[PDB]
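Structural prep section.
Before we set up the soaks we want a predicted structure of the protein with zinc ion in place, mainly to decide which crystallisation condition to try first. Input record follows.
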Amino acid sequence: ARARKGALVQCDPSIKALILQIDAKMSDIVLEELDDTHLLVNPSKVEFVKHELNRLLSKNIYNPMD
Amino acid sequence: SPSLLTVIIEIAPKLWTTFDEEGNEKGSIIKVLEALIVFLNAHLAFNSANKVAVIAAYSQGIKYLYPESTSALXXYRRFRNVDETLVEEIYKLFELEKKQIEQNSQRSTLAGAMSAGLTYVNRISKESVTTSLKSRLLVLTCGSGSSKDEIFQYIPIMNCIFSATKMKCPIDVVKIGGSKESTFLQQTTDATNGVYLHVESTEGLIQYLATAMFIDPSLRPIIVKPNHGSVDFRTSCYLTGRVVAVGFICSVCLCVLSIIPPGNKCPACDSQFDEHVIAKLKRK
Amino acid sequence: KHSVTQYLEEIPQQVQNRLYTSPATCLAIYRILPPLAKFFIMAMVFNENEVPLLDLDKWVNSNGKLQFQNAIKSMKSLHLLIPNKSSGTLMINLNPTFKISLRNALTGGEVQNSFGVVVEENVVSLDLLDEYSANKWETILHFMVGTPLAKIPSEKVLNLLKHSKLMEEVNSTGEFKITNEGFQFLLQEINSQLWTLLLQYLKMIETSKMDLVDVLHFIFMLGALEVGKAYKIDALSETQRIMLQDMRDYGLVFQKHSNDSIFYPTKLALMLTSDTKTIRGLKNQDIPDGSLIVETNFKIYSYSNSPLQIAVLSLFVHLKARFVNMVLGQITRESIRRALTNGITADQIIAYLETHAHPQMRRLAEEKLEKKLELDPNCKEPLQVLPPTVVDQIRLWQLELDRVITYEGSLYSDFETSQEYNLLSKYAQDIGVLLWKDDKKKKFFISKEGNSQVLDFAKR
Amino acid sequence: KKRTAKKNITPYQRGIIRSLILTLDCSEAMLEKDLRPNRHAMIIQYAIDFVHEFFDQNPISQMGIIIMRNGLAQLVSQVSGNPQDHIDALKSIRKQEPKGNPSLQNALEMARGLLLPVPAHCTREVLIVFGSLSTTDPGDIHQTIDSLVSEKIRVKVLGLSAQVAICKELCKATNYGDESFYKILLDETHLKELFNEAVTPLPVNKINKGFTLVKMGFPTRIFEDTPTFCSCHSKLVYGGYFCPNCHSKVCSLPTVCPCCDLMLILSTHLARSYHHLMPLKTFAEVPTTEKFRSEDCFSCQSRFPXXXXXXXXXXXXXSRYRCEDCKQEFCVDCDVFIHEILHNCPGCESK
Amino acid sequence: RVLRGKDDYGVMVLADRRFSRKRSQLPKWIAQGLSDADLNLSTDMAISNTKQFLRTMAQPTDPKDQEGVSVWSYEDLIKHQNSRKDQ
Amino acid sequence: QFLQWCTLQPENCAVFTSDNKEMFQTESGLVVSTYSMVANTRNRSHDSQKVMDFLTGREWGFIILDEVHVVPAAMFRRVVSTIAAHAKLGLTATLVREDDKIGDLNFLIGPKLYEANWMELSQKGHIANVQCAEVWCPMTAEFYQEYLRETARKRMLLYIMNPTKFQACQFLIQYHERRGDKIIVFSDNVYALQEYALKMGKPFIYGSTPQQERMNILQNFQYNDQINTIFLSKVGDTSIDLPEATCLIQISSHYGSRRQEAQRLGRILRAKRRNDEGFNAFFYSLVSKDTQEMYYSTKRQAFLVDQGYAFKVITHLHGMENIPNLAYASPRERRELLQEVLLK
Ligand SMILES: [Zn+2]
Ligand SMILES: [Zn+2]
Ligand SMILES: [Zn+2]
Ligand SMILES: [Zn+2]
Ligand SMILES: [Zn+2]
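Run finished without errors. Recording the tokens verbatim:
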């Protein structure tokens, strides 16, 4: 019985490109890259993947809502 | 997933008393009761507070034991009150046992008690919309001679099968006594998807009860273990008494006979059949 | 829910057989064993004759062994048995403590909880001592879960809320807010809130005067048999009596007055063990007294309300005013987003609406269900069940609050030949055990259920 | 004021052996909106409930369905004892919407031919779902009605919320002069009881006729699984029945074997007739002042049966509907079931 | 002319505005049947009114106990009750 | 547009315009005019004032009003006193209006009898099963690049030009023509709207279209089924023949003010004598997301549900990337058109 545990980060390729840069900011915690849609990551720093994603959308857009 | 097990253990002086005569007098129906009592306790134990009921049938009367019908006006301790009501009621139920109880030896209140169980199940399932219960009733019949197949209560017993299919309340039949396969009961279980077990009377019924009477109530995920064959050759001709395969139904009388009747006004109805109608019957 | 059956399987074997020694505990854990195991447990409990797994394979019908696989895996996980490989088969024998424990309890035994209950003048009726426990539980609901007023008499309840993650607020300052643990606990209808918080009480006080098995045996003792006279005072060990006294003060146990009396039959423990009707300064109105608001017009119409009940609702819908019967709140994408910013994914509210707050949604769903079981092969047109439009609204809003979708499972390998990957994939489609498959990379990220059964055939 | 059966259905003769062919109607009159969905969709479902109950209470009978569309009489299921085929045809009828007007005379002409293969013992009956206010008679409809009465073909019609003399004359003429089968419907529940009253046999006055002594068989069960086969459908039948005479396999059903042509019935056909032939006296509400019973039920345990000294609650009624001969009290909810599905009176049996 | 006996029944619709004023000119047996609630009806409502008439009247409602008030079954209720009417 | 089938007399009902002259103060019967002709700054000549003088000497008993709300009510009171009218009739459309001045037109004319119950006429068969939608076309770099760089209203067409919006429209183009429905597109712009439907190669309504051609485009639209997509510009209102509506697409979402939106929503969404589909009246709001039209579209989302019409959101077309005419689908090509739209 073989098992390799982790956290999968998956989305459309455009969002996937943004996410991979985000994890790259913290020494590339992503354990492995299966393909262009699936990314195997350690579940330790996935919360940091979404938190850095939160900052960049707020810092850039600032939610003008015009 | 609670289920309602309405105990119907018939105590018929015609049927129950002969048990001591056959074989040896090594014990009463107490095991028949108590294995049923603990099976009621086990049935009460498996499901989350599944209501139950105990009904008995004299030869000339009926009475409940566990439901504790209106007369005044350890371990979880619930199994005690089931038994406490049981031992108290079964005592006064047994106390109402004398010649009047045995008086109707030709008559049988086991059909009434089975009818009582269906009515009790029907009322309980009607009112208990909350936490609907897949009810099923178990009847332990005293397999004894001198009444292997009675004919007057034939109508009510075969009607009880309809409700079991109608109300989704399987009837479980255990024959307790000699090897007299009750054909009406032998077919009641198969027709209503229950269990027939002509077990040996002395055998601790729980071993059969927990095996063959534990699938029907609510789960039914596994193969049941029935009695022997369920051959579909029904009751004998009333005029003669011989088992018939291709019967001869007379008329709106609905009695199915042999070739014995003279072809007009069978000894079950006053209806002069057409002479030519008999001629077609006699032509073969 | 913390899934205590998956937490109780982490505790070692010695303390598991410690629990099986009490027939009351064996019956209580029996009610939570899976029904296929329930049949297996009672089967092996009665005749303790060693039988190879092949014969037990003959007993059951066709496919449905998924219950069998998870049951025996659960049986080994919590070690209620011990697999003995005698003749190369599985000579499954029930754990000696667990095998013997159910012998008494099934046959009217003396389980320490079952027979430890004392029959006496039960002055605590069904409405006796439960309304205070419901109020004490209600108080700990406002303090731990987060309500307008935290009147809970269980100080240890509040402290367990902070360190143990029972309250998603400032634990150091003494507050109880709504957080990731609180949203998950409050998302559970009954068991999730009860099981998650109870673990902190056991986990926190579990070494000094706690008596891990002793406190558990007492908790199983209360459900093992009705305490009645001298129940809470008597049916409680050193950890149990302190836990029962703490439960009596904290609302965990419906003890009598003075912190030392007979066990009054409160409905809180009955709710945890039997998992039945949750309906209980002396008015106890139910069951449909509580209710909630849901509508296709994206507007909440509330006519029956409860003090603490609206507090939970207002955590995910905008609260403006309370009337004699109406509470102002308009469910939209914005409305769910109130708790979505706090990180609470809009997953447990979907189950929340159809399980709780539905007593006011009875007639609204009475046109939903439409008895679509027997007529399902006959008519294939749903009458909006389960609600997809509100699901579409929430899923669109919840996706916005996350923008990333994460899947759980385990990556696999050793797909050397193309035949093995395809054959499992096609059956995976029949059972829906594969999230996604690909023959080119020969890797997928799912759970062990697909892996386990293939090896089961390989091993047996 | 009490609404029960008057005295008792005197058990002498009722029609169990029958072949009732209901004639539905899919006409633009049924496109006119009277029921909840429409006239056409709703009536089909209550006939769908009627079919199973008709087989439930009269299992030794056969069933046929007739539809009327665009002024033509059309049959969708031959006179047969197959519940599932009748429903399957009605589904396609349900799938379609009505058009045109009904044709009474063609159906009456259809009815005479359709019940010709019906056996003599089976009591002839044709059920008319006539709702519209006109017919389509390509000839003398009074001639065919004269044929059905002479050839002893009783007709009961189930009219909608409209009264027509021709249908009333048809009911009067065929049913041995008796005019008691012209009940009409006005509600969702109202139309069902017309079907439900058609489920039970319809005796008014049975005449003296040449009675036929007919021969019928009892099958036997099978158990083979791998040898799965049947001589009736010639399919992969993993379980079925066998005629004791022909030894020709049939599926598990009362299906008549296609080899020696003798009627096959298992247990229900004889038993379902028995409870119809001899109904017991209705358990009328025993007087509260004349109750003299304990405050509970007898057949079951319904302790509620007396308000006792509570103004307009006490002097009301009581859950003490007692059987006449058995002299045993019973709750109204219980005593109704005592005569609803199975008679099975406890006090009568417990003797 | 539309009614023949007591058993006979049927709607008699009249369509004119001035029929509101001519309620006096209607015969008392008919005029009594024309209450103030049947003035200036809508014909589509009158279709519903005759729809209800077709639903109610066509029913074989023969209670046979409410008959005797106005049916006076054979040689029984006439001798019984009309002697009270000779006052 | 409709009054020819009506039995009213076109030659007697002198269409008062003040620029084209007809017979006035001489009609023996009824006339048809407008408030602008009556008394406004739109008095092209003294002919209008001559009608007003005659309306005093002639005792006019009934005046039919058509969408009074556009014209301020202050002229309504001025004309009434001089005209000396007997009775009136204001056949307005909007529940909320600027003509709620001290003199309410209700009490000025008389008590209301019937209300514009739009839920009755949008569910009884004309426009029944109103499936309002708001298409959120997937974003990309340039829309996010355009949102951040400039926030002026000049961007109003810089998110309209979304090729996925046109492709999202193209799903409605192929789906509804296959369903035998009618597809109506609303776009206040001209040049970018013209660029739209040339790619799909079908006749289409566009800005400053020749009128005979557009009704000829309408001729293939509601009479024929091969051509079913019409792109109505701001020339539609006010006012032209509002077409039968089965699938209405709105691209402009500002369209000030909200009272015009209630009129426009009611106008273009018109009677459709067809009931084959279960949803015989579609509505779609093709709106680019993560762009400026977030606020404007969300105003519509609340507006349609508050109007009573049934609402949904269409974001996932059935096979979006496999639909024909995949021009400008890639993110690079979309940016190029955005700079072309900068000219507008
Ligand atoms: Zn006979
Ligand atoms: Zn077959
Ligand atoms: Zn045969
Ligand atoms: Zn009786
Ligand atoms: Zn009863």
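Observations: Strands of chain A lie at 4-5, 7-10, 32-33, 38-41.
Flagged for discussion at group meeting.
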